[PDB]
């Protein structure tokens, strides 16, 4: 059948699709990302993300872990700067107790102090594993230098805050952001009815709108990290459109025109205007792409470069110059059509998997409360037109930039030189 939606009177969104899949997936989406902290409770969302297997009012940690592993199901937590999503999946004959476990974890945690004291070492280990690659550190640095208050908060807990996060901070964060008006329960392979019954036994008691977050403010700037890596990583972004505008579609078409990942293994990603503009001048190994991260109040669009330290300068300059050409109208309609085809194929392959489909429905729910059929999107992406793309470009080419660099930065340029 099709997707089916009810908005409960306490604000909770219920979305269901019954496709008679053998494994069914049920997720719950909360607007409780890392942007809702301030300077007093930094890293609380990271410990909340890692604290999904703790003792709840209704099931202990042992009961939750052994009961999910007894049926072979999976419980995972994915977190962005805006949203958290707790997802369980398993056989249709065990999803009743899977919803019991998931809704107990979402609605009634206990946050015992010895459990979080044991979890803080796992927090340090998870942060080290996450920052084992340079892209994660340079994106966290880029957000920290790009924003002032809200989106500048890191996804991972700072080093000083480990050992300082308490049970009361987790309880305050849950009581202020895990309310029914910020939650959507999305189920693929389940009946809509059951979602509702579990949405009344749970998800209905906490029904405020919660604590409203601050508006994110752009700051500009640049933070660098000399650490002696073999490759220089550099991200240069500017403020862009937010979630809910056609200029966001223009910026997505702009990154697929500039280059948003290789389609061929071992390809040179020939088309990418960026990749072409770098490769016509530099014979060193490189990786140049376009970065776009848009959240419900603000967006970041820019370029991302990995290169040899020595060439790091002009490669960045070459990439920047290519965007300036797009800001001068130097583009062809066939290139924009190919960018639109790449963007729509990427969207359809993102929603072709079950967990990606459940995430998409989830995101749409929290964001606009409505489901937008894949088809609808296709025609809206088509709405973006050439001039629109050019426009977004000039926004990037003019707006104050924010630069995060890491590596041997002896030949990496600055923003006033860039």
């Amino acid at each position: 059948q099709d997707l089916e939606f009810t908005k409960l009177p306490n604000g909770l969104v219920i979305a269901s699709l019954e496709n008679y899949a053998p494994l069914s997936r049920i997720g719950l989406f909360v607007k409780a990302g890392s942007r809702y902290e301030d300077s007093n409770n930094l890293g609380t969302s990271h410990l909340l993300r890692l604290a999904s297997s703790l003792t709840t009012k209704g099931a202990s940690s042992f009961k939750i872990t052994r009961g999910i592993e007894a049926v072979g199901g999976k419980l995972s937590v994915t977190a962005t700067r805006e949203n958290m999503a707790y997802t369980v999946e398993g056989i249709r004959s065990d999803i009743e107790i899977l919803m019991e476990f998931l809704l107990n974890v979402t609605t009634a945690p206990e946050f015992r102090r010895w459990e979080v004291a044991a979890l803080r070492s796992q927090l340090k280990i998870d942060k080290a594993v996450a920052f084992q690659n340079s892209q994660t550190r340079i994106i966290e640095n880029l957000h920290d230098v790009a924003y002032k208050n809200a989106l500048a908060n890191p996804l991972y807990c700072p080093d000083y805050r480990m050992g300082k996060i308490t049970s009361e901070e987790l309880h305050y964060f849950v009581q202020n952001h895990f309310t029914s008006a910020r939650m959507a329960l999305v189920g693929l392979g389940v009946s809509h009815s059951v979602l509702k019954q579990v949405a009344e036994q749970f998800l209905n008691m906490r029904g405020g709108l919660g604590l409203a977050g601050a508006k994110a403010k752009y700051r500009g700037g640049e933070i660098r990290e000399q650490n002696g890596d073999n490759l220089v990583h550099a991200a240069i972004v500017a403020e862009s459109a937010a979630i809910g505008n056609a200029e966001a579609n223009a910026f997505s078409v702009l990154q697929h025109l500039l280059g948003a990942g290789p389609h061929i293994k071992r390809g040179n990603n020939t088309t990418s205007l960026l990749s072409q503009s770098v490769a016509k001048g530099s014979h060193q190994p490189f990786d140049v792409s376009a970065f776009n991260a848009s959240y419900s109040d603000s967006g970041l669009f820019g370029i991302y470069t990995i290169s040899q330290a020595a060439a790091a300068g002009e490669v960045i300059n070459a990439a920047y110059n290519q965007v300036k050409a797009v800001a001068q109208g130097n583009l062809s309609s066939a290139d924009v059509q190919a960018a639109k085809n790449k963007l729509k194929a990427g969207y359809l392959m993102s929603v072709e998997t079950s967990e990606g489909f459940l995430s998409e429905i989830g995101s749409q729910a929290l964001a606009a409360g409505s489901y937008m059929p894949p088809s609808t999107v296709l025609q809206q992406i088509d709405s973006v037109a050439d001039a629109d793309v050019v426009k977004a470009a000039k926004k990037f080419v003019s707006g104050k930039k924010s630069m995060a660099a890491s590596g041997n930065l002896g030949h990496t340029p600055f923003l006033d030189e860039l």
């Binding site: 202990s60 042992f62 009961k63 052994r66 102090r113 010895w114």
Partner: protein
């Protein structure tokens, strides 16, 4: 029964060393797990009370009668934390049994 329990509390004699009831529990695995889950202030008072009782037993003395632990006053602090350890312990055991 209440008065006879007070008389037995006086006859047990750990109140004369200033100890609580939960200080006198034998530290098995469950008791050590319950002690580890205590807050820092309760743990520090328990360690000081045990050290003072050991010092008094070293000098073969007791506290003055005004400093003894009144039966009514004794607080079963470790008890709440202990029950949980036992509950969790049993749950795990049952799971294995089955």
């Amino acid at each position: 029964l209440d008065g006879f329990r007070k008389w037995y509390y006086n006859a047990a004699g750990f109140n004369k060393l200033g100890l609580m009831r939960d200080d006198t529990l034998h530290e098995t695995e469950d008791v050590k797990e319950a002690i580890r889950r205590l807050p820092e202030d309760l743990y520090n008072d328990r360690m000081f009370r045990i050290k003072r009782a050991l010092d008094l037993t070293m000098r073969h003395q007791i506290l003055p009668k005004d400093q003894w632990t009144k039966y009514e006053e004794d607080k079963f602090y470790l008890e709440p934390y202990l029950k949980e350890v036992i509950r969790e312990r049993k749950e795990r055991e049952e799971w294995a049994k089955k």
